[PDB]
Design a protein around this nucleic acid. Structure first.
Length: 30
RNA sequence: UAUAUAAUAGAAUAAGAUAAG
């Protein structure tokens, strides 16, 4: 899709919904 | 889409000299 123009947006944002769909343990830490 | 859990037992029965206050 060209209209996205390299912008993931909400699907690739930092929102709590996207940060609550992984199980890594947050051990190493960003 | 993750690297991890830990429980079964039993027996009846005694040796004995220190150069002291």
């Amino acid at each position: 899709n060209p209209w996205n123009d390299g912008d993931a947006g909400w699907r690739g944002a930092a929102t709590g919904a996207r940060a609550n769909r992984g199980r890594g343990g947050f051990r190493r830490g960003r």
